[PDB]
Design a protein around this ligand. Structure first.
Ligand SMILES: OC[C@H]1O[C@H](OC[C@H]2O[C@H](OC[C@H]3O[C@H](O)[C@H](O)[C@@H](O)[C@@H]3O)[C@H](O)[C@@H](O)[C@@H]2O)[C@H](O)[C@@H](O)[C@@H]1O
Ligand SMILES: OC[C@H]1O[C@H](OC[C@H]2O[C@H](O)[C@H](O)[C@@H](O)[C@@H]2O)[C@H](O)[C@@H](O)[C@@H]1O
Ligand SMILES: OC[C@H]1O[C@H](O)[C@H](O)[C@@H](O)[C@@H]1O
Ligand SMILES: OC[C@H]1O[C@H](O)[C@H](O)[C@@H](O)[C@@H]1O
Ligand SMILES: [Ca+2]
Lengths: 153, 1275
């Protein structure tokens, strides 16, 4: 019941083979028992990305054909939602799976995605020909009209 | 906070609210379905912010709003927090932005240089962890790793020159040092990286132009060959031989005692003459009790592995394993250990073994020890079988195709048959090289249906089924009437013609519609091009229509929120430009569209006869039911074996989800009522109804109806009364996207018997039946649908129904779907002068007698619907009104075809009356077929004309000879069987032995009962495979994918394998096999004279199949036995055998001859002798240290000479190994590395020694190289 790393740095967990979840983290080990790190591996019908150092399952994006696609932590492709990539960028993917670009209103709130499809947070701009500050938290557009100071004279 | 479920999420003004099952808005902290969330006082949900509840400071995620760890700046300072809101002590936390802090014992973040968990790390002045960069600390520069943040050696470019930095931040001088990527460099006294060939500390290393140290690299460096170590890169001359085992003789004083008593089947446990890893044999003498050698008696059998081994690796493993079990001094032996030592150690183990045999007075303990040990070794388990799960391999882990090999395995020869993948579209093999080749392999032992002898046997079986009652009970009323052909695309398409022609011959199905429709027959034919084939071949069996089943998935049945529009049901592309006004059919299209157009179907264009469905025993059932068990931790994998209790528990969750009042379904299908309403009104199809939509799929047969039962029952009875005539179908929609007024609400109409069009006002034969017939259906897929106040929705019931009063059959609302059984209990509404029923956002309907009813055209959401459903029928319908058409006895058609899509065929309904997940009968009285007999009445009145019964064949059950078991087998559903002719017969001792569905009498009674009620019985014909055959044979096998194509990177090619392929020979297959063919050939000669397409030959009844065996099979799922379980000598590559005394091959030890083993030099070169004492020729051999060698035809190791090319082309007996290798001067094969030839060109050689060509290749340090087609490296 421990991990061990080789001279190279390949990692086993005593060995488990296939899809397993040691200490609540989803990992994939090859048929020879080595831990998959920093790559998409195919298990069952769902493609999963496993992180560079930890080897834990995480959301990631890859380029299928010429279009960016998004993959969640469970290996399912993302439709109608925000999903990250390993670097830390957030994207939004529509019902058809395709990444969105530019100014977008979803669920009654407005977000700004740059040309690369990166969700921009803590971003001020005249977007609708009217000022709009995009939240540091979720990137949702506020008008920055309400005073945020809480202390009257 | 305790969890809640059944409350939907609502979005107001950009915010998520949650409304309870109670229907009250939720505030405060809440665990909803295992997710911890918060709502402020207004009821809005919080995301990406911290909240305070009780004593806890809890952050909630920015996407999901789910409670998780973060760092908050609290007053002036950072403080970490967990998922439950507790201040963290002595832990790392990552904040929202992906930055990392470590908080000490006092919960305060550490700053500056720190050693944590034996790791050196740095933190900036604000407490943040440095990752992926250099950093000057304590007058030293240190690199910290990208994700761990741990101190490591790295290189940076100072000025224009690379420099090296170690883990402690000191620059490197006079030493090797790495970089993050993984490249090693060497840096001299002046700090500068070195290049080229360098001698340091009395050893020589090769650094390339980039300064990378090259390991496992062969090349001529000093104009003399030099191999650079895989470990440290240190140059060796590769002149010393690395093999450690000289030629030694093995024979000694125990050899004659342990030698075989006899060279034949008496003294050797075997299969078809060959030997296996777990073979036991009879030694001449026995060292009883470890004391005295005594002659053996016949029963004194001993394991071959006590005395012989295939190689030293295996021998060393055997010794180590048996040692660990109390048998000796526990030992660490390797293949490197001397042969003499291993043999001595084997004997001390042998002694100990005989002592525990005397002590226990048994050998069973040893049988188990050997079995256990054998499975440990890769050559004798699945590791050498290349288990894979893509494609149909998903089911069982992979397939082996058997081969015709008369020299080694002649019983298993197919007589040049075994054509694979002759599915309908590839019946002639013309698509063998493409994906159009059929997936011949599916489950278990795949029967060779391309063999004329097997084809005859399948016909015998077919005859037996169609006359089951006559044959087994002399009851001419207990016979099946038609068939379902299971797994059409996984078998030879000849079987369709065979079945077709049989029915023609015996029942004159090509003579009339009445004959044809008396023997309804369907195909499980999934390929999208099967419909057109089936039709070109005269529709002997009905194709399925996946195009409509598919569209139900997309537009109604699948997905809670995003669905294709109802518009897609129309397939407007059918007409040129989709001109619904002009209606010119598009004669040419790009292979697309629904099989039967229903926009304005007046019966004028010929169409392909077909059956259609919403669900099946094997469609939208098996996966959901398992996902539910997985989701609740009852099993881990879809392929996992589960018990019936495990199934029962899972079924309870499945039922709970199915009947969920919220209306949301996680495993189950949406809108089943609405789907059935369409299925059951469609013209030009025979609809099929799934038991599991009417009754619960688990537990006992017909134990409890589903919530959908009432609605579907009503639809079915209404179909009898009203459904006839032409059809139209339209939508308030023009495409993917909806304009302002548009609802995307579909309107489907049928006119009545004889009325084919909207504008037709009366029948041509002046029959009046039409007036009280016809039906109107309105359906939507949007539960949040609200109409504009302007908007009106219309059912064009037709100009044959002007001014007529119509009443509702079925109407949806917010709590369910109301069903009206008769005219009086329902709201009425009258059509106008043009025959249209008009509907508005708000409607006030009047009951026929007095009372007023209010109804909104409103999408609804509940367990029975997610959208809208309204069905309307004409009032005044008689009680015995029947709108079906009887089939005509006349020869309607000279087209040669059997089935014809018309009003008579459409008058049928098939009931697929079983579920794969039924529980086993708790009592004889509750067996499916007993129940079916008592309840036959009920199905007559639902208008079922044919009852599709489960496959009645005896389940192979829990039996499993190797490899993965499948659910068909352990759930006893009848699709996995050992005996094709045992349909529930009693044990030979007289005792009852029912299938899951009851005895054979129960079946005959069930069939008779259905005929008494005017219904047909369908037999499931399952010709593709057979399970769990108890007898072993040795086949020649290749590892293949579903289409029988060799896997690309497999060594498992033409190897001998022990399969379970032989039937008991004393079963019902032996009694009834081939028996009815002679009678049939005499009576209908042409069946036996007609040539089949795939073979060019007619079926062959000259040979009867009473016992199955490998010669009639294409292959099997992998059995987990190993590539080399059948024992073989590595040196000659010949397999051991003892079948015929003229051609015995055994290891020389067992024949009391001297076996010499090892490497031996002579003037010409090096030779090798295997453990069994034979010289290696034309074979690859691995020494005890793991090095590989090739011995040529002459018996000499290949080795490179000075000044010559080390690269050699090898062509071996073992073909898979053919290729270009690089042998060094001491004969060692280079593997996983680069090799230079005599002319300075570099090549690369893979894991197994083969040269690699025409591709890019990557390195652990992220170096990329390119190999040209000729093998050379451009890089
Ligand atoms: O099969 C009957 C159906 O056929 C056509 O529509 C096909 C298909 O069209 C829509 O979706 C497009 C579909 O194309 C490929 O199949 C992709 O691989 C899919 O991912 C993609 O969704 C529609 O949404 C589907 O429901 C539909 O089946 C005809 O045009 C239809 O009228 C007809 O019903
Ligand atoms: O113990 C593993 C690891 O814990 C922390 O890193 C976690 C996390 O930090 C980031 O988000 C990286 O991008 C991921 O790859 C990491 O898994 C500590 O910071 C680290 O020192 C430690 O090794
Ligand atoms: O924490 C100990 C770590 O050992 C390893 O590096 C494993 O890859 C990782 O999964 C584990 O958590
Ligand atoms: O470096 C040590 C660290 O390794 C990583 C683990 O996830 C963490 O909990 C541990 O303390
Ligand atoms: Ca087959």
């Amino acid at each position: 019941k421990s991990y061990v790393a080789d001279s190279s740095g390949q990692t086993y967990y005593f060995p488990l083979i296939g899809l397993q979840t040691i200490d609540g983290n989803l990992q994939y080990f090859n048929q020879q028992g080595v831990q998959i790190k920093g790559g998409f591996q195919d298990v069952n019908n769902k493609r999963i990305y496993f992180a560079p150092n930890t080897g834990n399952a995480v959301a990631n994006t890859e380029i299928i054909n010429g279009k960016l696609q998004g993959r969640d932590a469970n290996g399912n492709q993302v439709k109608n939602a925000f999903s990250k990539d390993v670097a830390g960028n957030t994207f939004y993917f529509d019902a058809n799976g395709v990444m969105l670009t530019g100014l977008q209103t979803i669920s009654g709130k407005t977000y700004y995605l740059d040309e690369q499809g990166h969700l921009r947070k803590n971003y001020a701009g005249t977007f609708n020909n009217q000022f709009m500050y995009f939240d540091a938290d979720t990137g949702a557009g506020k008008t920055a009209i309400e005073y945020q100071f809480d202390q009257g004279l | 906070s305790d969890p809640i479920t059944g409350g939907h999420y609502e979005n107001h003004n950009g915010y998520f609210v949650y409304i309870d099952a109670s229907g009250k808005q939720v505030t405060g902290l809440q665990n909803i379905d295992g997710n911890l969330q918060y709502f402020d006082d207004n009821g809005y949900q919080v995301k990406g912010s911290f909240r305070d509840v009780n004593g806890k400071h809890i952050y909630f995620d920015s996407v999901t709003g789910k409670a998780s760890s973060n760092v908050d700046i609290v007053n002036g300072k950072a403080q970490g927090y967990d998922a439950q809101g507790n201040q963290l002590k002595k832990s790392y936390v990552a904040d929202s932005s992906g930055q990392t802090y470590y908080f000490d014992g006092n919960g305060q973040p550490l700053i500056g240089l720190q050693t944590i968990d034996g790791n050196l790390q740095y933190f900036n002045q604000q407490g943040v962890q440095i990752k992926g960069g250099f950093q000057d600390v304590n007058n030293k520069r240190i690199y910290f790793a990208p994700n761990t943040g741990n101190a490591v050696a790295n290189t940076e470019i100072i000025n224009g020159k690379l420099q090296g930095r170690d883990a402690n931040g000191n620059q490197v001088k006079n030493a090797f040092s790495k970089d993050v990527a993984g490249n090693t460099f060497y840096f001299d006294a002046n700090g500068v990286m070195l290049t080229g060939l360098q001698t340091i500390s009395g050893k020589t290393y090769y650094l390339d132009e980039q300064g990378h140290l090259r390991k496992n690299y062969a090349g001529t460096f000093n104009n003399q060959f030099m191999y650079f170590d895989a470990d440290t890169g240190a140059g060796k001359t590769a002149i010393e031989y690395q093999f450690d085992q000289g030629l030694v003789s093995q024979s000694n004083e125990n050899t004659p005692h342990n030698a075989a008593k006899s060279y034949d089947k008496s003294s050797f446990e075997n299969v078809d003459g060959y030997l296996t890893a777990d073979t036991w044999y009879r030694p001449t003498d026995i060292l009883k009790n470890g004391d005295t050698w005594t002659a053996s008696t016949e029963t004194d059998m001993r394991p071959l592995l006590m005395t012989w081994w295939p190689d030293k690796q295996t021998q060393a493993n055997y010794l180590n394993f048996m040692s660990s079990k109390g048998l000796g001094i526990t030992t660490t032996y390797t293949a490197a250990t001397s042969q003499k030592t291993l043999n001595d150690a084997a004997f001390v183990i042998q002694t100990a073994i005989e002592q525990q045999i005397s002590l226990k007075k048994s050998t069973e303990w040893l049988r188990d020890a050997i079995d256990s040990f054998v499975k440990t070794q890769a050559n004798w388990n699945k590791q050498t079988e290349d288990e894979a799960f893509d494609g149909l391999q998903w089911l069982q882990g992979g397939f082996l195709a058997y081969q015709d090999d008369s020299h080694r395995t002649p019983n298993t020869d197919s007589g040049n048959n075994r054509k694979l993948g002759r599915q309908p579209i590839n019946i002639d093999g013309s698509k063998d090289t493409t994906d159009g080749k059929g997936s011949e392999f599916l489950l278990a032992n795949d029967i060779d249906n391309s063999n004329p002898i097997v084809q005859a046997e399948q016909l015998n079986w077919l005859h037996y089924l169609m006359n089951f009652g006559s044959i087994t009970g002399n009851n001419d009323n207990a016979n099946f009437d038609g068939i379902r052909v299971d797994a059409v695309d996984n078998v030879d398409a000849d079987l369709l013609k065979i079945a077709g022609d049989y029915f023609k011959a015996l029942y004159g199905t090509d003579k009339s519609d009445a004959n044809a429709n008396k023997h309804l027959s369907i195909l499980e034919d999934w390929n999208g091009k099967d419909p057109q084939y089936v039709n070109q071949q005269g529709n002997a069996q009905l194709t399925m229509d996946y195009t409509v089943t598919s569209q139900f998935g997309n537009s109604l049945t699948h997905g809670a929120n995003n669905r294709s529009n109802m518009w897609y049901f129309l397939d407007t592309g059918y007409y040129l430009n989709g001109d619904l006004n002009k209606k010119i059919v598009d004669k040419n299209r790009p292979n697309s569209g629904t099989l039967v157009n229903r926009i304005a179907n007046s019966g004028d264009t010929k169409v392909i006869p077909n059956y259609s469905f919403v669900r099946a025993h094997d469609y939208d059932a098996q996966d959901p039911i398992r996902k539910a068990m997985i989701d609740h931790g009852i099993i881990k994998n879809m392929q996992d074996t589960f018990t019936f209790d495990q199934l029962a528990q899972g079924m309870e969750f499945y039922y709970k989800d199915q009947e969920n009042p919220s209306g949301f379904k996680k495993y189950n299908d949406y809108n089943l009522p609405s789907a059935y309403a369409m299925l059951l009104t469609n013209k030009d199809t025979v609809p099929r109804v799934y038991y599991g939509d009417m009754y619960l799929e688990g537990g006992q047969y017909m134990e409890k109806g589903t919530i959908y039962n009432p609605v579907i029952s009503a639809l079915l009875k209404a179909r009898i009364k009203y459904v006839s005539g032409g059809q139209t179908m339209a939508t308030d929609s023009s495409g993917k996207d909806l304009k302002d007024g548009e609802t995307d609400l579909l309107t489907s109409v049928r006119f009545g018997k004889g009325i084919m069009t909207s504008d037709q006002t009366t029948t041509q034969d002046n029959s009046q039946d039409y007036k009280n017939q016809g039906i109107g259906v309105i359906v939507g897929n949007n539960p949040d649908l609200k109409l504009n106040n302007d908007k009106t929705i219309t059912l064009h019931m037709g100009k044959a129904h002007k001014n007529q009063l119509y009443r509702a059959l079925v109407l949806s609302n917010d709590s369910g779907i109301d069903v009206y059984d008769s005219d009086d209990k329902a709201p009425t509404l009258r059509t106008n002068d043009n025959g249209d029923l008009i509907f508005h956002k708000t409607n006030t309907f009047v009951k026929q007698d007095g009372t007023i009813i209010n109804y909104e055209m409103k999408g609804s959401l509940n367990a029975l619907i997610s959208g809208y459903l309204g069905v309307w029928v004409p009032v005044g319908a008689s009680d015995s009104q029947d709108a079906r058409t009887v089939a005509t006895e006349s020869s309607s058609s000279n087209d040669g075809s059997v089935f014809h899509s018309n009003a008579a065929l459409d008058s049928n309904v098939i009931y697929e009356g079983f579920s794969n997940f039924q529980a086993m009968p708790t009592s004889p009285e509750q067996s499916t077929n007993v129940v079916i007999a008592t309840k036959a009445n009920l199905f007559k009145e639902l208008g079922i004309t044919s009852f599709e019964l489960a496959p009645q064949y005896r389940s192979s059950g829990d039996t499993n000879y190797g490899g993965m078991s499948f659910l068909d087998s352990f759930l006893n559903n009848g699709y996995a069987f050992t005996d094709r002719y045992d349909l529930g017969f009693n044990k030979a001792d007289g005792n009852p032995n029912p299938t899951k569905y009851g005895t054979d009498q129960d079946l005959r009674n069930a069939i008779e009962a259905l005929h008494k009620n005017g219904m047909q019985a369908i037999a499931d014909w399952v010709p593709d495979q057979i399970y769990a055959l108890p007898g072993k044979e040795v086949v020649t096998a290749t590892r293949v994918d579903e289409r029988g194509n060799q896997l690309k990177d497999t060594d498992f090619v033409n190897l001998l394998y022990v399969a379970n392929t032989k039937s008991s020979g004393v079963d019902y297959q032996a009694k009834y096999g081939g028996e009815f063919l002679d009678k049939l050939r005499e009576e209908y000669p042409s069946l036996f004279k007609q040539n089949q397409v795939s073979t060019g030959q007619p079926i062959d009844a000259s040979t009867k199949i009473k016992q199955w065996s490998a010669k009639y099979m294409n292959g099997t799922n992998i059995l987990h036995r190993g590539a080399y379980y059948v024992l073989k000598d590595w040196a000659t590559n010949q397999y051991f055998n003892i079948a015929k005394t003229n051609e015995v091959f055994l290891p020389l030890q067992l024949q009391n001859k001297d076996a010499q083993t090892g490497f031996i030099s002579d003037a010409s070169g090096v030779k090798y002798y295997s453990i069994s004492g034979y010289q290696a020729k034309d074979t690859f051999i691995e020494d005890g240290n793991g090095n590989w060698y090739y011995f040529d035809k002459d018996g000499y190791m290949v080795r490179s000479q000075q000044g010559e090319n080390p690269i050699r082309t090898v062509e071996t007996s073992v073909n898979t190994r053919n290729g270009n290798y690089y042998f060094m001067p001491n004969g060692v094969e280079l593997r996983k590395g680069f090799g230079t030839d005599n002319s300075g060109n570099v090549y690369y050689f893979d894991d197994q020694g083969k040269m690699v060509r025409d591709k890019y290749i990557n390195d652990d340090a992220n170096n990329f190289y390119h190999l040209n087609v000729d093998g050379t490296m451009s890089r």
